[PDB]
């Protein structure tokens, strides 16, 4: 058999903006929901550009880029930040320092590195693009790069204008409301140490998946509205339907994460449905309940005694509503909710 | 998946006809096996009767029949109780009281009742009818309610004679029950899905008869393999009841048939098993009815096997019962205790 223990339950709460205030400029990142929605949170990379000379660049090459967070193939990242620079047409060289560039699954995001660089230059230099021909730019990378970014229409609206009102759906408007799902639900990206951090996202986006979501966001604001029909419930149909699809071998991590979640689910109250992603399992809690101890601890178990390779860690990463891509400034720092995140280190030992 | 579990192991004893100590008799209740034998339990009906009034009665309804023990279309056996008191010819009013009429299918066994009564009557009056005018009676009402109760005469004949020394066979024809008894335990097992209101779907024959009878005759040695001793002929007959052709086994039948093959291959104890419409007879060796983890693991093969949820499990003990008899005080120590245990159980669906 096999024993599963809980060495350590490590609570965090940080303002990573207050951290860093040239100009410093942040956009959200995203997750998704039914592979047909974004939402942006508050989790965001930010970006500080300071002017080092008042001339013409030679190239993109000449403005120095600080120490970029460590992640797979970063070279690769600074080459896409290098042409991006590129079409920006900067008439000053500078030194950009960029932060918190990988999102919840631990994956680089290029969306919101190159609009928080934009907002950063923006506020720099005269003469910079509008948001129409930053779209036309961040295409252009995207397809010279072979960029792999599902809906990435949906997610770099999400981007621009956040979600403290919308949840982004892929076009048929065709945004949900999300101030009702908020006012009910806790969100919390789960991952553990199995779950990839490198990987090509391998989603189906729909329209009629983007119906449904679209539809269960706009049902949470009738209290009377049948749980079976809200944004939980549709979550989980979707993920019990990822996991029996035709055109998609699921990952072992996924399918694992789908067996404990379904139990937890039938379990807990207070467990209200979830999807698994290659990155790690989207999941609805009643409100506040990502703040008991007990019910993190029982969900950290579940997942860790229906994986059949042994976890050692598994964190629980509450996701608020983003505002959308903004300058930072001292008057502005505030409108940055904390982020909340719990880490529950683990032993799963084969026993006699 | 299905999740098992145990709610309550529940043992029983009693001694029923002890309570009851006017005239009182009793008549065992039977179960058959291979459809073409039959054995008198250690079960029976009981009938109490005091006379009221000593005058004819103005016509069978006039006896006071208590409160028959509460069982399906109870009005129909009410009218077949009028009919059989009418050809009895009875010369007095009486108060007439029936215990324990239900079978271990918890059907109302007509057989038994007629016969306690017609054992209290003939110690209560002068001029009741002998055995062979009783036989031609019951058939009368037999036939006269169309009821269905295959092998009638065998079960008249086990009924009277008691199974205390032979089994009753369709005639061609008995086999003696001495050696079969000294080596196993006959159980009647039953689930809360096993129908107590059933129309009996059996196939006696002369083949069957023959092979009960020589497997009952073949008990004596010790020597004698298995598979031709009485419990291996119920298990062939059980998988070939569940395979014919000319009968749709009930679902709980086959899936009992399923849980008691798989029982008896993992366990020495489990020597064989018949499924019936209401329930299953099973031989155990000897003494195992007792052993509780072993009436544990049968009830869970039921259980797990059984596509609907089953809530508990009956296991009846069953001993060779005697004939038909008046009690007395003298003869009332005559009867084993009968023992049962039952199960409760939950069968729920799971993540």
């Given at each position: 058999?096999?024993?599963?223990?809980?060495?350590?339950?490590?609570?965090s709460?940080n303002?990573?903006?207050?951290?860093?205030?040239?100009?410093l400029?942040?956009?959200?990142h995203?997750?998704?929901?039914?592979?047909?929605?974004?939402?942006?949170i508050?989790?965001?990379c930010?970006?500080?550009?300071?002017?080092?000379?008042?001339?013409?660049?030679?190239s993109?090459n000449?403005?120095?880029?600080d120490?970029?967070?460590?992640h797979?193939h970063?070279?690769?990242?600074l080459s896409?930040?290098?042409?991006?620079?590129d079409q920006?047409?900067?008439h000053?060289?500078?030194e950009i320092?960029?932060?918190?560039?990988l999102?919840?699954s631990?994956?680089?995001?290029?969306?919101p590195?190159?609009?928080?660089l934009?907002?950063?230059m923006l506020?720099?230099?005269?003469?910079?693009?509008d948001?129409?021909?930053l779209?036309?730019?961040?295409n252009?990378?995207?397809?010279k790069?072979?960029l792999?970014?599902?809906?990435?229409?949906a997610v770099?609206?999400?981007?621009?204008?956040?979600?403290?009102e919308?949840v982004?759906?892929?076009?048929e408007n065709?945004?949900?409301t999300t101030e009702?799902f908020?006012?009910?639900?806790?969100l919390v990206f789960?991952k553990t140490?199995?779950?990839?951090?490198?990987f090509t996202p391998?989603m189906?986006p729909?329209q009629?998946?983007?119906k449904?979501?679209?539809?269960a966001?706009?049902?949470?604001e009738?209290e009377?509205?049948?749980?079976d029909?809200?944004?939980?419930?549709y979550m989980?149909?979707?993920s019990?339907n990822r996991?029996?699809?035709?055109?998609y071998?699921?990952?072992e991590?996924?399918?694992?994460?789908?067996?404990?979640l379904?139990?937890?689910?039938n379990?807990?109250?207070?467990?209200?449905?979830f999807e698994?992603q290659?990155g790690?399992i989207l999941?609805?809690?009643?409100?506040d309940?990502?703040?008991?101890d007990?019910?993190?601890?029982?969900?950290?178990?579940?997942?860790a005694?229906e994986?059949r390779?042994?976890?050692?860690s598994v964190?629980?990463?509450?996701?608020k509503?983003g505002?959308?891509?903004?300058?930072?400034t001292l008057?502005?720092?505030?409108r940055?909710?904390?982020?909340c995140?719990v880490?529950?280190q683990?032993?799963?030992k084969?026993?006699?």
């Amino acid at each position: 058999e096999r024993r599963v223990k809980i060495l350590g339950i490590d609570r965090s709460e940080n303002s990573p903006v207050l951290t860093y205030m040239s100009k410093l400029a942040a956009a959200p990142h995203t997750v998704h929901m039914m592979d047909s929605g974004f939402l942006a949170i508050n989790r965001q990379c930010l970006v500080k550009g300071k002017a080092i000379l008042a001339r013409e660049p030679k190239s993109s090459n000449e403005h120095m880029i600080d120490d970029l967070p460590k992640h797979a193939h970063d070279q690769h990242t600074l080459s896409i930040l290098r042409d991006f620079i590129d079409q920006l047409k900067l008439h000053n060289v500078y030194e950009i320092n960029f932060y918190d560039p990988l999102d919840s699954s631990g994956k680089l995001a290029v969306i919101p590195m190159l609009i928080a660089l934009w907002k950063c230059m923006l506020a720099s230099e005269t003469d910079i693009c509008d948001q129409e021909v930053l779209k036309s730019i961040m295409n252009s990378v995207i397809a010279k790069f072979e960029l792999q970014i599902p809906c990435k229409n949906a997610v770099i609206d999400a981007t621009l204008s956040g979600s403290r009102e919308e949840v982004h759906i892929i076009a048929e408007n065709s945004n949900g409301t999300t101030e009702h799902f908020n006012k009910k639900h806790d969100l919390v990206f789960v991952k553990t140490d199995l779950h990839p951090e490198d990987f090509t996202p391998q989603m189906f986006p729909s329209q009629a998946k983007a119906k449904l979501l679209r539809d269960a966001f706009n049902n949470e604001e009738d209290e009377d509205t049948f749980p079976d029909i809200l944004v939980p419930a549709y979550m989980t149909a979707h993920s019990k339907n990822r996991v029996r699809q035709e055109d998609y071998t699921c990952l072992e991590v996924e399918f694992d994460s789908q067996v404990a979640l379904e139990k937890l689910m039938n379990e807990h109250e207070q467990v209200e449905g979830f999807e698994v992603q290659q990155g790690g399992i989207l999941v609805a809690l009643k409100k506040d309940s990502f703040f008991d101890d007990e019910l993190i601890e029982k969900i950290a178990i579940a997942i860790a005694t229906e994986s059949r390779q042994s976890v050692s860690s598994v964190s629980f990463d509450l996701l608020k509503l983003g505002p959308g891509a903004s300058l930072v400034t001292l008057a502005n720092s505030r409108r940055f909710e904390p982020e909340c995140r719990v880490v529950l280190q683990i032993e799963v030992k084969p026993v006699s």
